[PDB]
Amino acid sequence: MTPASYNLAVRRAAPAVVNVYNRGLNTNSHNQLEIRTLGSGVIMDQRGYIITNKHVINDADQIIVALQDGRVFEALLVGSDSLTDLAVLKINATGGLPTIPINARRVPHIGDVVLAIGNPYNLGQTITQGIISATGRIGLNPTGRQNFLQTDASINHGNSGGALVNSLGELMGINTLSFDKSNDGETPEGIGFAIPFQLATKIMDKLIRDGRVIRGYIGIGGRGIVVNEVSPDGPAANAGIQVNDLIISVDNKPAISALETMDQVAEIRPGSVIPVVVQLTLQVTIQEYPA
Amino acid sequence: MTPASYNLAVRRAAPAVVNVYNRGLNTNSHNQLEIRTLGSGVIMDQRGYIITNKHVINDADQIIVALQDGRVFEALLVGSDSLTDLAVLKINATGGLPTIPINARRVPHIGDVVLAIGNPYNLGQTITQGIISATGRIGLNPTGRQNFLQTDASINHGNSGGALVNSLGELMGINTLSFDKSNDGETPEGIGFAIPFQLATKIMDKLIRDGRVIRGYIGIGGRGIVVNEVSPDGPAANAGIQVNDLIISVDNKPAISALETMDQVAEIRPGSVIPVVVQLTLQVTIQEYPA
Amino acid sequence: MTPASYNLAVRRAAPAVVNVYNRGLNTNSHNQLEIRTLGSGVIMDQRGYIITNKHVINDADQIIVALQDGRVFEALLVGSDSLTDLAVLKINATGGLPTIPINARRVPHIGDVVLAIGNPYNLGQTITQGIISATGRIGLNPTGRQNFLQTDASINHGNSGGALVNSLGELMGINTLSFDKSNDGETPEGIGFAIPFQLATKIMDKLIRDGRVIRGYIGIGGRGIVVNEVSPDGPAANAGIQVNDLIISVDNKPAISALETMDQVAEIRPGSVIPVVVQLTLQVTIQEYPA
């Protein structure tokens, strides 16, 4: 017979994950480019756009990307975002580049076998398999390290930026980090997180068209949609809205949930204005999220 | 094609695992119900019975159970058992309850893919896959943390009480991982334990019919069946039997092994009496296991 | 339906993995055979040869081997090798022995599902599944703990010597197991190593025909094939070759790579002589690797 195996996935996607190297100049007294850090990255399209974790390329005087085919490139940082730890690099490749399979039509499911491609502890490219333990949201609104994708695939230090792909090689997400906890008593085995591919995608496109992800701020909270503690003063305060009420429509559509609502405000460019219901339609001008 | 995936099992059994919260009153000075601990639990039948680990609900002034569908319930402790760390709660659900798939006809096998549904570190429901690395016994006699079910599936803190199900959603066991994990000089990966479903079944039923699991005590040891150290002074001493001999028939059937023998004595209600053989048939009255 | 399962593989290969016990006499003051250590081992053929990790049987006054069928044997150490941590024992079994499936025709692939059979923490035989994350070389030349086989299958202490088999039971490698940490901060999760079956084979045969693995030493380094730091003063000095040049043909064949070249010199018995090329063909006598 044939042994059970996920090599097909490896063949189809592995060639697209890269080693990202963060090189600083002031790392030594002789001020030469030294490898301050390193992680992994996923070549997104043939134009040369590579996704990766921000915490990898932060304060990097240089960024080198290297392919499994041996080609080495200097990368231009086109933008990052703290609220997701995603960063978008760009190599200028002539000759063709391998690209991570993407299937925008595929919906990830709790339980789907998934492999994590990356370069942890800088041992070279390694693959590890697990399943999707929790899916998380593809919204643009930051919530925490719980609305990501969760996997029991082994995510070590060096998998950051790597690819989490299903058995068909399809990119399910960008590995971000492990769960190491905050303290001890023990270690959290098999609890890793990845940013959903669908979101990495949204973020990348923005990081390209703007050099930074522009989120629409409405400063309000809650649990229609409860408005519990709406004392940020930013946009809430400035133009209708109270420190305790219930909204009906974020802009001109239902305000069923709090999460699904914020996820809309953020997708609204600054300066714009929209009619906020509770039936006293009070308009408000959207600002830009805080630093 | 279609991504390899164990989602079917997740769909069939996930809805039945619950978040069990141990709330104490004297946890703070304002003596309010504070979440002293927490674990997971499996809704066993439509009557509202839920299995869980004892160590989760111990000394709980209150017990709250929450479903993935959002419904929350106050749970009535119907019993527990130290020798297995199993506890049976009971929520009073009108409207219908989701129930963990069970297939008493199914025999677990070393190597079967199995998923562990539970809520570790209180991150919300998480699934993790592994295989059965060892099966263990379904007996009622306590032996240790070796005659359980052993799985490399990721069992973290908060998986206690959760379900361990095979690819079909069939309940293979109740996650219980107990603490002997460590040596000296490095943390034990992929070695978790679960109580065979067959036994969790036996125990729950008893916890229901008696509020406590009543075990039949004999007071002997060994390796027919060797009667090594038979100096408990229990019912063994009180009625024939020596501090060094060989038994022939626990009650009126073969005494082939020591394990399979104890597992019978325990299934014999106290006060009863049975003929013990070795050919000098000496009768003995069964007592009840120690506290 | 049927539960997803790797049981077939377990049935086919588990029976061949054995518990290896290292018993020393001077472990106590009453100088009796005490279990100084322990690991696992794979019965390679019906003659009674068993492979294992050197670091298990080192300085063992005695060695006991035990089968899953219950049979116990006293083993004869036929040899070991440091550069691979492989040891070969030999039990003298009459009545027949179970043997690990081997398919020398099979080529291991990154991503192949694979199970690790072994006895970690001495809890009895345990199975764990993972995938091959990196393959490594089957050469006879020592390189490091990187040209081994790499798997995310859980390799714990007591898995050393165990077998790593694919879904068909086929022997993929002998679990070695690198001590993971070597420093702190975090712990290398899911990164285990095994010696390729293809090499364990080559090594065992040598350990048999010679009691020690005789390697052919040259004394050179580099990156044709660069000869960068050819100052070891062995046979390289003694008869042509410079401290900085480029070789053309290890013996009478291409010298394309440095790795694949050394892998040849080692397979050349001492005393022999071969023509080295670089076009000034200078012959050299092969010595024997250092202790």
Q: Tell the overall outline of chain A.
A: globular
Structural category of chain A: mainly beta
Number of strands of chain A: 21
CATH architecture of the largest domain in chain A: Beta Barrel
Cα-based radius of gyration of chain A, to the nearest Å: 21 Å
Superfamily (CATH H level) name of the largest domain in chain A? Trypsin-like serine proteases
Largest beta-sheet characterization of chain A: 7 strands, antiparallel
- The domain tally of chain A reads 3
Notes on the protein architecture:
- Three copies of one chain form a homotrimer.
- In chain A, 11% of the residues lie in helices and 35% in strands.
- In chain A, the strands form six sheets. In chain A, strands 5-4-1-2-3-7-6 form a seven-stranded antiparallel sheet.
- The first copy, chain A, is mostly beta strands and 291 residues long.
- Chain A has three domains: 121 residues, Thrombin, subunit H (Beta Barrel), CATH 2.40.10.10; 92 residues, Trypsin-like serine proteases (Thrombin, subunit H), CATH 2.40.10; 78 residues, PDZ domain (Pdz3 Domain, Roll).
- The first copy, chain A, is globular, with a radius of gyration of 21 Å.
- In chain A, strand 11 and strand 12 form a beta hairpin.
- Chains B and C meet through strand 9 of B and helix 1 and strand 9 of C.
